[PDB]
Design a protein around this motif. Sequence first.
Motif, PDB file in Angstrom:
ATOM      1  N   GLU A   1       2.268   6.436  -7.272  1.00  0.00           N
ATOM      2  CA  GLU A   1       1.559   6.862  -7.342  1.00  0.00           C
ATOM      3  C   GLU A   1       2.087   8.520  -7.848  1.00  0.00           C
ATOM      4  O   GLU A   1       2.401   9.158  -9.113  1.00  0.00           O
ATOM      5  CB  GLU A   1       0.274   7.294  -6.773  1.00  0.00           C
ATOM      6  CG  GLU A   1      -1.002   7.850  -7.594  1.00  0.00           C
ATOM      7  CD  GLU A   1      -0.948   9.219  -7.436  1.00  0.00           C
ATOM      8  OE1 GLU A   1      -1.447  10.495  -8.384  1.00  0.00           O
ATOM      9  OE2 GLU A   1      -0.233   9.764  -6.021  1.00  0.00           O
TER      10      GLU A   1
ATOM     11  N   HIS B   1       0.982  -1.105  -0.029  1.00  0.00           N
ATOM     12  CA  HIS B   1       0.235   0.277  -0.416  1.00  0.00           C
ATOM     13  C   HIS B   1       0.418   1.659   0.349  1.00  0.00           C
ATOM     14  O   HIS B   1       0.151   2.372  -1.003  1.00  0.00           O
ATOM     15  CB  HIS B   1      -1.153   0.144   0.845  1.00  0.00           C
ATOM     16  CG  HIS B   1      -1.958  -1.480   1.296  1.00  0.00           C
ATOM     17  ND1 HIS B   1      -2.564  -1.515   2.076  1.00  0.00           N
ATOM     18  CD2 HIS B   1      -2.729  -1.781   0.092  1.00  0.00           C
ATOM     19  CE1 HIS B   1      -3.241  -3.063   1.708  1.00  0.00           C
ATOM     20  NE2 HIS B   1      -3.353  -2.206   0.169  1.00  0.00           N
TER      21      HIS B   1
ATOM     22  N   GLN C   1       9.364  18.082  -5.925  1.00  0.00           N
ATOM     23  CA  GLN C   1       8.472  17.696  -5.136  1.00  0.00           C
ATOM     24  C   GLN C   1       7.717  16.546  -5.234  1.00  0.00           C
ATOM     25  O   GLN C   1       6.561  16.112  -5.152  1.00  0.00           O
ATOM     26  CB  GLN C   1       7.495  17.666  -7.246  1.00  0.00           C
ATOM     27  CG  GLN C   1       7.335  19.249  -7.924  1.00  0.00           C
ATOM     28  CD  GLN C   1       7.585  19.698  -8.794  1.00  0.00           C
ATOM     29  OE1 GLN C   1       7.520  20.813  -9.712  1.00  0.00           O
ATOM     30  NE2 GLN C   1       6.464  18.658  -9.657  1.00  0.00           N
TER      31      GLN C   1
ATOM     32  N   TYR D   1       6.246  12.385  -0.576  1.00  0.00           N
ATOM     33  CA  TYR D   1       5.843  11.371  -0.667  1.00  0.00           C
ATOM     34  C   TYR D   1       7.366  10.613  -0.599  1.00  0.00           C
ATOM     35  O   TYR D   1       7.857   9.437   0.724  1.00  0.00           O
ATOM     36  CB  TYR D   1       4.731  11.050  -1.181  1.00  0.00           C
ATOM     37  CG  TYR D   1       4.191   9.298  -0.165  1.00  0.00           C
ATOM     38  CD1 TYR D   1       3.301   9.625   0.873  1.00  0.00           C
ATOM     39  CD2 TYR D   1       4.563   7.886  -0.320  1.00  0.00           C
ATOM     40  CE1 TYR D   1       3.264   8.585   1.361  1.00  0.00           C
ATOM     41  CE2 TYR D   1       4.590   6.736   0.106  1.00  0.00           C
ATOM     42  CZ  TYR D   1       3.550   7.013   1.460  1.00  0.00           C
ATOM     43  OH  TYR D   1       3.084   6.124   1.861  1.00  0.00           O
TER      44      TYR D   1
ATOM     45  N   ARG E   1       3.241  10.722 -10.934  1.00  0.00           N
ATOM     46  CA  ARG E   1       1.961  12.079 -11.562  1.00  0.00           C
ATOM     47  C   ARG E   1       3.001  13.244 -11.307  1.00  0.00           C
ATOM     48  O   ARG E   1       2.946  14.282 -11.681  1.00  0.00           O
ATOM     49  CB  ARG E   1       0.678  12.522 -10.359  1.00  0.00           C
ATOM     50  CG  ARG E   1       1.072  14.094  -9.531  1.00  0.00           C
ATOM     51  CD  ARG E   1      -0.487  13.761  -9.392  1.00  0.00           C
ATOM     52  NE  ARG E   1      -0.255  12.849  -7.884  1.00  0.00           N
ATOM     53  CZ  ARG E   1       0.469  13.436  -6.901  1.00  0.00           C
ATOM     54  NH1 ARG E   1       0.811  14.472  -6.419  1.00  0.00           N
ATOM     55  NH2 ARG E   1       0.385  12.661  -5.768  1.00  0.00           N
TER      56      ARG E   1
ATOM     57  N   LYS F   1       1.525   4.424  -3.249  1.00  0.00           N
ATOM     58  CA  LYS F   1       1.482   5.969  -2.790  1.00  0.00           C
ATOM     59  C   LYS F   1       2.017   6.560  -3.019  1.00  0.00           C
ATOM     60  O   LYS F   1       2.623   7.237  -3.521  1.00  0.00           O
ATOM     61  CB  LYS F   1       1.618   5.840  -1.319  1.00  0.00           C
ATOM     62  CG  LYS F   1       0.067   6.201  -0.834  1.00  0.00           C
ATOM     63  CD  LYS F   1      -0.039   6.689   1.039  1.00  0.00           C
ATOM     64  CE  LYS F   1      -1.253   6.493   1.759  1.00  0.00           C
ATOM     65  NZ  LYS F   1      -1.938   4.853   1.956  1.00  0.00           N
TER      66      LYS F   1
END
Lengths: 451, 452
Positions: free
Chosen positions: A288, A281, A306, A309, A292, A285
């Motif tokens: 993604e 999981h 940027q 995460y 992006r 994250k």
Amino acid sequence: MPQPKTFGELKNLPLLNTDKPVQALMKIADELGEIFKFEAPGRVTRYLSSQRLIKEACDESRFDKNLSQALKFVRDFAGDGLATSWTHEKNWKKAHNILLPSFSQQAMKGYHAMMVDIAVQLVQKWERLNADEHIEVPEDMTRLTLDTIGLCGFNYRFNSFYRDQPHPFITSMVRALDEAMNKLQRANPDDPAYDENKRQFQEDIKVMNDLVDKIIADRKASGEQSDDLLTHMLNGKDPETGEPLDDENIRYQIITFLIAGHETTSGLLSFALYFLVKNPHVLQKAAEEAARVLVDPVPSYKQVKQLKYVGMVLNEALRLWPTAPAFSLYAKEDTVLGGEYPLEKGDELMVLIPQLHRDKTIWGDDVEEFRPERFENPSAIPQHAFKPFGNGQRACIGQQFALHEATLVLGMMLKHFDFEDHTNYELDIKETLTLKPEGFVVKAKSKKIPL
Amino acid sequence: KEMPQPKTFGELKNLPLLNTDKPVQALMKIADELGEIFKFEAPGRVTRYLSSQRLIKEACDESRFDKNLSQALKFVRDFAGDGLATSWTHEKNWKKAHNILLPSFSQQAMKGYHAMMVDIAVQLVQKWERLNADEHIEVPEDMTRLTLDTIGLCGFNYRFNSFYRDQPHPFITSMVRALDEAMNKLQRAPDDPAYDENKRQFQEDIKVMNDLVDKIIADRKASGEQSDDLLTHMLNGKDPETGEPLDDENIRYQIITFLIAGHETTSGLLSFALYFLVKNPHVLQKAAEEAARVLVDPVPSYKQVKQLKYVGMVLNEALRLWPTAPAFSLYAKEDTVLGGEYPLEKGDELMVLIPQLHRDKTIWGDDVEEFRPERFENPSAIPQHAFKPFGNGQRACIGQQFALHEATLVLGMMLKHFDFEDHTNYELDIKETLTLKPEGFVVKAKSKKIPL
Ligand code: HEM
Ligand code: HEM
């Protein structure tokens, strides 16, 4: 003060005669608590594990950096570079003042292109694997960090991705480090059996010195200007003394960058990928975000900043397994630590970083879980609770370099591949002077995104 | 590209759509019709309401968007000042108070507030233990008594003594009336003489709040006493960045802010939680089983509250369906494209419609209207920025740990000590101020006769 089991005249020292001494010290800390004394013939130290005591140890008015025995043995080939120098040595403050601007966050803009060069080589290698071939993660990560530091440090290409046997400089450095590490737990060092080790050690020192001294001399003779640290050091002047670094210290700084940076940074990337594939999981994250944010065939400096995460993922990997797992301090004067432990001038302390990062009074009860969300808002973290890069003016000068490279590389890995823990790898942490997950292997399935 | 927009009223554009008693629920219905984004225009103001995780995850990118003060927050700022909730990120007092107060609101800091929270929680249980047969509970009214007194005690060690009163302590009356006026100003079509009394009352209530809080701060400084409250932490704290402490005026605004921002959101959470529990008897029984198993002592410990895992899931599912701070506002720091199809100019405003976000079927599935705490069995499965009842980033709710510890402790004790009956078959009626609550929600509590 608590103290672990003893071995007669050898006191506690044989406890370190193991291949996993940091993990052994962590288990002792589990049993004995926030502080324990460790005695050996001719040496006493105290291992600290709590934020309560380590925040006092990090008071630079009361404690200064000490050279551990590990650092003392490394100085035999790292010399008076930043990592193996005492704070009171003229060459520390001189090099510190000269080099700090070249390691700033703003300075990472100039190294970014060279970092991308090596990172694209890593991605290209993995794109070119056949079906049911696999990746040796710390091995490729060390190829990547060595070549990146060599390129950004003095514009030299070790070309590790073209080799099974590394460039002779790398072999000598790794073997010199191994000998330095092996000396820590070596009894009867003057015995004739170690004569060969000593001969090999002097040979490897010359290999490292000869190559770097040659590159320094080549650069001075050519007069060319590159975007590397060598150029900054050839042109830099200490604002305090007005002096530049001499050629010998420049060589020691270059050797130091490779020693201090290559295995710490490769272990971080290896531990990061380990925790990602063990926590699907969290990987989703992080994947993604990379998809992006990294919308261009080659990541820009702006885009790497940027990857918030991904940055959190790396900090949480540094929390659980800080790859430079300890540092040493000495008391500048007599002082009382924690209001109950009296310390005399010169008394030594060790900061056991992996234990510090498991302090339940700081992090809660779930300290063993991998949750990057701990670092969602950095300001929530108390002072001196998270110290993967050391403390104060003796902190890691390469912190921004290390996190920029690791954020760039992990982001690109997550952009271009899906990863499979195809062996259900069992974590096995190999200990040198740093930590890494030995034998960690994965399969990577390409997403077919061009570069 | 072409952004949807609800019906217009000539020169008034969309603004009369908000001249209703339930504007959030009205906005949710517009989102149902128009989708993940619609433009909302009024004279002199344009904003965009977002409802999908796809777009809101971009809005939560702090490199592209910063917190904006909505008109609601602007009106609240007249008595909340430059406290955390009504200050701009670029104001010196925001970053200063943020740095100083964050350690005092951590999960670990809840250990120090737990005893004062228990104090008020025991008063609540004792009130319900002392009701006569066939008496009933006014749920949001008692929950608001409970959260106001808890914040007053943990905030500045002051007892409003709400459970001893029908008419609240004058500070609370002034605060509640000031909030009502700030809310009523939103849809007031303002300089008319009919509002002269409103303006006089507003300044009077501001003076009441300021005078009491300024007095307590001055009393504390003169006494020099140290308590386990936020006021002590603020009197002794220093921003590590600037090296400065908060001054007495900003400290007063932080205390006022804690009561404003925390009292109604948290009491609404407890009220909605109990509502969904009595409407879902199998879930209530599961939560009551956990409370009985975990809370084995006459008074709950901090450690036991953390073990109330299912109670925590119950509260999160209540926050999903009816987040009691139902929206927040953002502005574009620079020109940017939202979702790859909507170009935004620097300064453009966004509103995040939290209850609609929490009904995004692409995230939660088709049963988004069902109350299933099991959705939160493994929090890590939830995608980023899909569940935002406490806002986003550095401007998120600083009181999140306080609120959830308070609600978990109180709900745990309620479930330990009483069986509950939905004796009127209560029909949900969500009253809207700046927050949401189930108006008129009443229950009967039958004691289990477990002593405290
Ligand atoms: C990403 C993983 C890294 C970690 C975990 C790490 C950790 C540390 C730690 C803990 C110290 C202080 C040791 C002590 O107090 O004895 C230190 C110092 C140092 N590190 Fe790193 N490091 C990393 C990467 C790097 C890189 C990439 C470079 C160079 C490009 C570097 C260069 C240095 C230097 C020169 C010092 C000595 C600074 C001084 O004392 O003036 N490190 N590092
Ligand atoms: C349990 C229900 C609660 C909910 C749903 C909630 C929700 C929120 C939300 C959504 C925001 C961000 C608003 C915006 O972006 O404009 C916020 C901010 C804030 N809340 Fe809460 N809150 C709750 C309880 C509390 C409590 C108990 C306190 C104080 C003890 C508190 C104090 C604050 C403060 C000071 C801020 C501003 C933070 C900043 O901008 O630095 N809230 N809250």
